[PDB]
Design a protein around this ligand. Structure first.
Ligand code: PEE
Ligand code: PEE
Ligand code: PEE
Ligand code: Y01
Ligand code: A1AVC
Ligand SMILES: *[C@@H]1O[C@H](CO)[C@@H](O[C@@H]2O[C@H](CO)[C@@H](O)[C@H](O)[C@H]2NC(C)=O)[C@H](O)[C@H]1NC(C)=O
Ligand SMILES: *[C@@H]1O[C@H](CO)[C@@H](O[C@@H]2O[C@H](CO)[C@@H](O)[C@H](O)[C@H]2NC(C)=O)[C@H](O)[C@H]1NC(C)=O
Ligand code: CLR
Ligand code: NAG
Lengths: 29, 675
């Protein structure tokens, strides 16, 4: 694929994270 | 005999090794053991296609894809897809044989070996119930659980209602007791007793009866946290004693029934529920089949006196004196004692493997600590430096990884760095140097770095028994700020967010404020920081309580100069979101007013309204339709797994066909039979 990004795209500290549900370390997935 | 019924034995039985061996080999009814074996086999058969990933093996283990893998030992490597499918088939056959009781030992080994191979092949899929399943299979491999309710005994004559040694029940009871007690002791943490780990679980509708007489905070602290700790600490003691056996059984059943619905942990709740009757009398199935109406008592196998067996020993006062224990009787006692010592010591063995000790002790999966620690990640940056020219480049976080657990462990980070170093020359990059920058907050704390961003992980030194030097310590002397943090978070509007950051002295943060992030400000809390503006190159020192305002669409830097860690916040609003929502509200309310007397912006509201209407209709819709959909999804998964396994078996045995046949077969595999 493309494993590279820009400099303005790798430094956005404040952004919608992801938060893929709870994703606790005891969940099946 | 005062203590001859509250414990099951006497004090004189533990005075010598021979007496202990005689006690541990006491004959016992194998009925409950057989029921547990049947239930465990059935649950494993139902679980293998779902949780172990048999349905996604083709996706996970493609022939020529670039992926970084995280095994316990780098010497362990996976096989091609066909051989992985064969291993899964062998595991399924072993589980089926274990359930049915046919060829007990062979099936037990055939389930045990590939299961542990798959478990050790990946460190990012470890949890507590998989570890429990492995331990249970290991224990059942050495037990005589086919002496009742089996198929081997229906073909044989000696495995038909024989007797089993006492330690078979002792090992299982001890395992369950250690599970409960160790979980309870691990829950004696500061973050648990103060109600910080699970502060949102009390809002579920299953806790409604408790809200009638208790407040939300009181029902979240008293019931979820302290009640859970008490039940974990007292379940084994309540279950062991026959006086309080019924009450403990009711409590544990209620607990596991709620847990099966609160989370999605697979078949953990059902295994725990089925393991509870093991604490009852060994002959409960016989009484249960005696209590049924007589019209159904003539089809089940006849209830008669069990026949003698060679596995156990018989000590009688008139029926001869004593049989000298051999190499099979003492081995059972030795295995019981050593296994219980190992199970008691392993969860507290984190002072030896110091290289696996991050913020949280040890590798996750074998310490019986569930839901205790919660992690929220804010930002990950990967930066590589070309070793030939020197250009600075940036990689996507997790390009060749199929998991996200590498951000919390140093060994996984080292493995990822080495994998990237191997695969980067494929993309016109010379020998690189990779630096990682990860911000993690644990249990609603300040966001802080976990690894040093100035160290090259490829050339760093990591050892299993040596404490890692590039792991940042957790700022323990900042927890009491959590009340103020919650107050500040709750004292905000419905469109303003806040992010709390703690920085170490000597480091700096480079941030790019987005164009749409208007009205962005930074406020200091502790220590002193210097805020820089890259475009115009202007520093500005700040102190406690001061507030700034940062322009949007530009870079800025925050430097920590105090000799102590400093804390500050970001306050920002999505002005684009505000403008879009206000114009949408205008265009909707005025349109409704005109009507009562498309474009993407209207499309978003149309989709939201459609989703709300569908949710309301589903809520009004009875649960039978959802049950039917759930059954359909499960049947689809099972059929896909079976078809792909058959395809791979045919390919492996007969021979590799042409490309066209494989495409047709794969397309037929995914069909969603009926809807
Ligand atoms: C807090 C740490 C632990 C404190 C001590 C525990 C006190 C009792 C609470 C334990 C709850 C469940 C754990 C059970 C573990 C194994 C014992 C067991 O299952 O007993 C069954 C069985 C009798 O059963 P029945 O005659 O059916 O009686 C039915 C009971 N109404 O008991 C025995 O045979 C006991 C065997 C002799 C002791 C050997 C087992 C003890 C294992 C200890 C683990 C460490 C191994 C070596 C011990 C070193 C120190 C002694
Ligand atoms: C082939 C013909 C054989 C004839 C008879 C067949 C017997 C089998 C009948 C049982 C029904 C078969 C079930 C088939 C699969 C059902 C679907 C299924 O398992 O779904 C999983 C679903 C959970 O879904 P997740 O995927 O976690 O959902 C979240 C989505 N991410 O799991 C289940 O429903 C588990 C169902 C099995 C429960 C086993 C119950 C055994 C425990 C009872 C213990 C009894 C103790 C009694 C106490 C005695 C006291 C004296
Ligand atoms: C064998 C399977 C056991 C399964 C048990 C599961 C539950 C228990 C969980 C145990 C957690 C860790 C204990 C295992 C220790 C062994 C780990 C190990 O050898 O692998 C580490 C390492 C891989 O490193 P990563 O960072 O994954 O990869 C980096 C390269 N890309 O593997 C190796 O390279 C092999 C190194 C061999 C080291 C083991 C030495 C053998 C021990 C004997 C030495 C005696 C003691 C020495 C001093 C004692 C001081 C206390
Ligand atoms: C007319 C044409 C389209 C035939 C297509 C039929 C398929 C829908 C059949 C063929 C193979 C069947 C599967 C064969 C074997 C099993 C194993 C069986 O395993 C069990 O778990 C049962 C025993 C237990 O409960 O432990 C569950 C049903 C399933 C997936 C069957 C589901 C339906 C399948 C995929
Ligand atoms: C989520 C909780 C614990 C994590 C956990 C889980 C999920 C398990 O699966 C475990 C299995 C075995 C051992 C430990 C496990 C474990 O640690 C507490 C959840 C709290 C629970 C929902 C509250 C119910 C208890 C109440 C107080 C009973 C009420 C009784 C009074 C009315 C008298
Ligand atoms: C930028 O955002 C801040 C914070 O959301 C706004 O400050 C608020 O101003 C109102 C009055 O208009 C006060 O009632 C609030 O208490 C203030 N918030 C805080 C946290 O003190 C500010 O008005 C916004 N500026 C613009 C131009 O929208
Ligand atoms: C802004 O203040 C910093 C002081 O923190 C000045 O010096 C930098 O200090 C950091 C702290 O370790 C170093 O990493 C940098 O190398 C220093 N230099 C630069 C250019 O960042 C910094 O020079 C000041 N900038 C201006 C424009 O006055
Ligand atoms: C074909 C190959 C890969 C099969 C691998 C089988 C070996 C590695 C498996 C089979 C049984 C397993 C053991 C079963 C039980 C325990 C007890 C546990 O508390 C620590 C791990 C330990 C000691 C396991 C280590 C791994 C083990 C020895
Ligand atoms: C909200 O802000 C994020 C950046 O944090 C931005 O990507 C997103 O587009 C904004 N929302 C809208 C509706 O524009």
């Amino acid at each position: 694929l493309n494993p590279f990004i820009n400099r303005r795209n790798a430094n956005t500290f404040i952004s919608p994270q992801q938060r893929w549900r709870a994703k606790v370390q005891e969940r099946i997935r | 005999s005062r203590i001859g019924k509250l414990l099951g034995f006497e004090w004189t039985d533990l005075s010598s090794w021979r007496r202990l061996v005689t006690l541990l080999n006491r004959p016992t009814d194998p009925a409950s053991l057989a029921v547990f074996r049947f239930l465990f086999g059935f649950l494993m058969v139902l679980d293998i296609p779902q949780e172990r990933g048999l349905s996604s093996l083709d996706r996970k283990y493609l022939d020529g894809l670039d992926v970084c893998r995280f095994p316990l030992l780098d010497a362990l490597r996976p096989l091609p897809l066909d051989w992985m499918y064969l291993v899964y088939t062998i595991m399924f056959l072993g589980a089926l044989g274990m359930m049915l009781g046919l060829c007990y030992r062979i099936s037990c080994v055939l389930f045990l070996l590939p299961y542990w191979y798959v478990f050790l092949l990946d460190k990012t899929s470890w949890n507590n119930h998989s570890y429990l399943y492995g331990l249970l299979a290991f224990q059942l491999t050495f037990m005589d659980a086919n002496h009742y309710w089996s198929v081997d005994g229906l073909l044989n004559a000696h495995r038909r209602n024989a007797h089993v040694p006492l330690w078979n029940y002792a090992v299982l009871r001890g395992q369950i007791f250690i599970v409960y007690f160790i979980a309870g002791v691990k829950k004696l943490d500061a973050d648990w007793v103060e109600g910080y780990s699970m502060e949102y679980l009390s809002r579920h509708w299953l806790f409604s009866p408790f809200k009638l007489l208790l407040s939300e905070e009181l029902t979240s602290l008293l019931v979820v946290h302290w009640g859970g700790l008490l039940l974990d600490l007292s379940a084994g003691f309540l279950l062991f004693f026959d006086v309080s056996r019924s009450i403990g059984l009711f409590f544990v059943s209620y607990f596991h029934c709620m847990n099966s619905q609160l989370f999605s942990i697979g078949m953990f709740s059902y295994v725990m529920l089925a393991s509870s009757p093991l604490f009852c009398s060994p002959e409960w199935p016989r009484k249960l089949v005696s209590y049924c109406p007589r019209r159904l008592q003539q089809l089940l196998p006849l209830k008669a006196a069990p026949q003698p067996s060679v596995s156990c020993v018989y000590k009688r006062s008139r029926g001869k004196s004593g049989q000298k224990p051999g190499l099979r009787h003492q081995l059972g006692a030795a295995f019981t004692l050593l296994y219980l010592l190992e199970q008691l010591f392993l969860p507290y063995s984190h002072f030896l493997t110091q290289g696996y000790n991050n913020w949280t002790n040890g590798l996750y999966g074998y310490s019986w600590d569930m839901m205790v620690h919660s992690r929220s990640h804010q930002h990950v940056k990967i930066t590589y430096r070309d070793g030939r020219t020197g250009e600075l480049g940036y990689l996507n976080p997790g390009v060749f990884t199929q998991s996200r657990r590498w951000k919390d462990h140093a060994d996984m980070l080292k493995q990822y760095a080495t994998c990237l170093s191997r695969l980067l020359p494929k993309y016109n990059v010379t020998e690189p140097q990779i630096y990682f920058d990860i911000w993690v907050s644990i249990n609603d704390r300040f966001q802080q770095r976990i690894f040093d961003p100035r160290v090259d992980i490829v050339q760093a030194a990591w050892s299993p028994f040596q404490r890692t030097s590039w792991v940042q310590p957790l700022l323990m002397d900042l927890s009491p700020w959590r009340a103020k943090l919650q107050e500040i978070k709750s004292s905000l509007d419905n469109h303003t967010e806040v992010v709390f950051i703690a920085d170490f002295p000597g480091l700096h943060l480079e941030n790019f404020v987005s164009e749409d992030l208007g009205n962005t400000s930074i406020q200091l809390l502790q220590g002193e920081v210097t805020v820089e503006l890259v475009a115009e190159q202007k520093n500005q020192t700040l102190r406690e309580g001061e507030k700034m305002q940062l322009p949007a669409g530009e870079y800025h830097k925050v430097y920590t100069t105090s000799p102590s860690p400093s804390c500050y916040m970001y306050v920002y609003v999505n002005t684009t979101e505000l403008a879009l929502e206000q114009d949408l509200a205008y265009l909707q309310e005025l349109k409704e007013k005109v009507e009562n007397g498309p474009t993407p912006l209207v499309q978003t509201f149309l989709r939201r309204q459609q989703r709300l209407q569908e949710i309301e209709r589903r809520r009004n819709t009875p649960f039978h339709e959802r049950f039917f959909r759930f059954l359909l999804r499960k049947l689809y998964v099972f059929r896909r797994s079976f078809l792909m396994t058959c395809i791979s078996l045919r390919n492996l045995i007969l021979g590799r066909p042409s490309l066209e046949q494989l495409a047709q077969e794969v397309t037929y595999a995914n069909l969603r039979p009926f809807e």
